[PDB]
Design a protein around this ligand. Structure first.
Ligand code: A3P
Length: 256
């Protein structure tokens, strides 16, 4: 097809929860749009200074009304944080999908989903291991190498609670998490007009996404498959072993 000049503004809002293929989608959207897509990885590896900003935003975000003077100030900060990006994925953004829709009225919405039990297992391996899981200590040790402290975990946990709209959440309760997962995905599809939404299941690949966005399928390029829990386990172990990101960064080409 013809090459056209795309606007550098949020064009795609993905409401997908972590461990539903957000990093692969991040990579895919960057392949399509040739501009950056937001993701927790963007925070970890490029903008750790954004952590306090997202934490602040979440703290104020209960005073959001579906436009008040308070809402406008919050929307202004949200827009600021996302300046220069063409899409959003992953925590902490996914919980803000309704607000992002208002801020970017011409953006389309995605929902990445998968088997709930596969999701739970993936979550326990990477994002939210149980309190008494020994692997939790390995995750934390490796993350320290990345310069991530307790404020990172606060943001991750609090942005997840925001997504689920829970004041308190028993992170060690599998059944609770599974229920929140189903309820969340259910609510996105009830909330977003079907015209404006595409639901993507893991494995769907380029075709439904590119049709939804009216772009050509990227020629010669397979749809990204990155950020498996096996790969995160390896990254954690290698960070612990080498004690720096730069010593091992060439070993994880498209992942980070
Ligand atoms: N193209 C693809 N096909 C199938 N699974 C994919 C995929 N891209 C990513 N995934 C899976 O999605 C999860 C990563 O999601 P996220 O980037 O949001 O954290 C991983 O699941 P597993 O942990 O079960 O391996 C990863 O294997």
């Amino acid at each position: 097809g013809a090459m056209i000049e795309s606007s550098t503004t949020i064009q795609v809002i993905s409401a997908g929860l972590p461990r539903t293929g957000t990093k692969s989608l991040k990579n895919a959207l960057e392949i399509i749009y040739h501009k950056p897509c937001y993701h927790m990885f963007e925070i970890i590896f490029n903008k750790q200074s954004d952590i306090i900003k997202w934490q602040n935003l979440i703290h104020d975000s209960h005073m959001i009304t579906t436009l008040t003077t308070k809402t406008i100030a919050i929307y202004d900060k949200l827009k600021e944080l996302l300046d220069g990006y063409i899409a959003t994925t992953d925590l902490p953004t996914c919980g803000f999908y309704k607000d992002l829709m208002n801020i970017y009225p011409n953006a389309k919405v995605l929902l990445t989903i998968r088997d709930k039990y596969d999701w739970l297992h993936s979550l326990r391996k990477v994002v939210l291991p149980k309190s008494n899981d020994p692997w939790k200590l390995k995750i934390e040790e490796g993350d320290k190498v990345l310069g991530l402290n307790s404020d990172f975990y606060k943001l991750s946990e609090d942005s997840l609670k925001f997504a689920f709209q829970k004041d308190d959440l028993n992170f060690d309760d599998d059944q609770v998490l599974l229920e929140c997962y189903d309820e969340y995905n259910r609510l996105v599809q009830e909330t977003v007009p079907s015209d404006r939404l595409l639901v993507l299941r893991l494995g769907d690949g380029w075709e439904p996404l590119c049709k939804f966005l009216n772009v050509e399928i990227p020629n010669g390029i397979d749809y990204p498959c990155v950020n498996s829990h096996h790969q995160m386990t390896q990254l954690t172990e290698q960070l612990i072993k080498y004690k720096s990101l730069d010593a091992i960064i060439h070993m994880f080409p498209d992942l980070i």
